[PDB]
Amino acid sequence: PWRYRLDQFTKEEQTALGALAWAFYQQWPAKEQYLGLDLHPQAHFISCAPQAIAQLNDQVNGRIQEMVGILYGYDPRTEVAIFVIGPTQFKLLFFQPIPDPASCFAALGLTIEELKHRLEKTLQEKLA
């Protein structure tokens, strides 16, 4: 069950994911890009403009309506909102870390390359 691994990956890697989110948010501080995951061919992080995910919603007749609203409303200083692309479904990694994402990034002291490589290596092991 890949939908089960992501829930424990979210619970276990809560600090590193918050450390990746804020650093990504530092690159796009006006929500120019949403942070996301693509599980195929293997788990790797991706991004998209908010307009892209809104148009996909129109194509699917508003079946990812709520995710577009959550992605529009979440506070990057307190919340992590990462969308996952499944085979023909979406999962939203959505949580409020302790500590805040900025504090997570300062605590781990890693750069965005290390956080990206570490989390993907770990997430691929949950799936593989």
Partner: protein
């Protein structure tokens, strides 16, 4: 932050209009339809707390469209974070696969 919005009506047509209005007025998911007897029925939506607030407001106002519609109660409850899931019918596989063709995998600005 996500929340849950509820509209309880006295009458079934009114509860159908409440649900339809809530999902058209804001970006929420209709998650529930509950019956407790005595003609009292409730529809429940979920989504971003700002979206949920706009759904309930428009859901209550649109009951006036219903000949004989009557609202009994309404409430909004804050919900903890959750890794929400959305399964799509198999006919949207092409639309998802084309969105996968639009994203980029280099999330690091070089």
């Amino acid at each position: 932050s996500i929340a849950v919005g509820m509209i309880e009506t006295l009458g079934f047509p009114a509860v159908v209009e409440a649900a339809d209005s809530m999902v058209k007025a804001a970006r929420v998911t209709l998650v529930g339809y509950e019956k407790i007897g005595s003609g009292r029925v409730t529809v429940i939506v979920r989504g971003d707390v700002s979206e949920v607030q706009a759904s309930v407001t428009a859901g209550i106002e649109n009951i006036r469209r219903v000949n004989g519609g009557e609202v009994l109660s309404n409430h909004i409850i804050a919900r903890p974070h959750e890794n929400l899931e959305y399964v799509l019918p198999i006919r949207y596989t092409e639309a998802v696969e084309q969105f996968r063709e639009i994203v980029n995998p280099s999330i690091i600005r070089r």
